[PDB]
């Protein structure tokens, strides 16, 4: 039951949102019709290396649908300070700058 990565283009459906304890939920839609596939998602501080920071909490996010523009929700645990949410792979990956306060725990 292991799916390949979703390699088509993602689009944020709304601005990512901070939860009570300082994680971030991220809703995206997927242009591909090649589901089922796994949504690539991470936090990074350096877009030129993509070294992961924080944690992906929804660690098996599966698009099951093959209709275009289907929607999926992710949750990540950002590091304190500034970072980027990174969804998708390749040249069409999308990023969103994020700031987590030291007090938001």
């Amino acid at each position: 039951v292991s799916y390949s990565l979703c390699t088509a283009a993602f689009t944020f459906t709304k601005i990512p949102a901070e939860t009570l304890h300082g994680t971030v939920t991220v809703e995206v839609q997927y242009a591909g019709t090649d589901g089922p596939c796994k949504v690539p998602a991470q936090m990074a501080v350096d877009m030129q290396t993509l070294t992961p920071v924080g944690r992906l909490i929804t660690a098996n996010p599966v698009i099951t649908e093959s209709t275009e523009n289907s929607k999926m929700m992710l949750e990540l645990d950002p590091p304190f300070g500034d970072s980027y949410i990174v969804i998708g792979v390749g040249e069409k990956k999308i990023t969103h700058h994020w700031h987590r306060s030291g007090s938001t725990i």
Partner: antibody
Amino acid sequence: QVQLQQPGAELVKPGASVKLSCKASGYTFTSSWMHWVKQRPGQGLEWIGMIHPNSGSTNYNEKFKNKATLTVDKSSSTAYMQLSSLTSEDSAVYYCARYYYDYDGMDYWGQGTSVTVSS
Amino acid sequence: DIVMSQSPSSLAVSVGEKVTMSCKSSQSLLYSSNQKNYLAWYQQKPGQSPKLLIYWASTRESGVPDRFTGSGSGTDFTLTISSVKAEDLAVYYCQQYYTYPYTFGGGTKLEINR
């Protein structure tokens, strides 16, 4: 063309401090993290840390978090590394490096400053 | 910190030989979220700064000849030079960038028998 200009040498007394400079050109200085790496003569490579010139954010190897301080001057496209309490094992070449792991830009390491710890 | 181990520490090869160098990590460098291996290879010729050869375990830096190939996944990686040239005299380092701090292997020094 990416260029990272570093002074050739610094002579430093045992236990003293030195400030190294790295002047960047040929790419957008503020939008690339600047990394620093240590290499003792005849030995391997040790990653010191990195700084983001636009924000000033830093990420240090804990081994270097007390003895190294990274700063930048955006107006002169210059990155700086101050190293303190130099030991005889800190006689080494210190590189600044624009790490770039993507198709549309060049990774580039400067020529390094040779730091000699001696009285 | 991730521990990177390279073997052999030195190797003696002839011009035209296909040379393979190994790099092992203490935990997987394959990030399941994007299926990328966070492993780079550097070349350092005598008296020069390191130069990036390979990133993502197998992607060549621009301008690097295709005689250099990176392979492997997870904890086990190799750099291959398909037919060694005299100019390839150098120390080769692998470096994980899966976690900060970045860490390097101890290098493989390539010496040339002639």
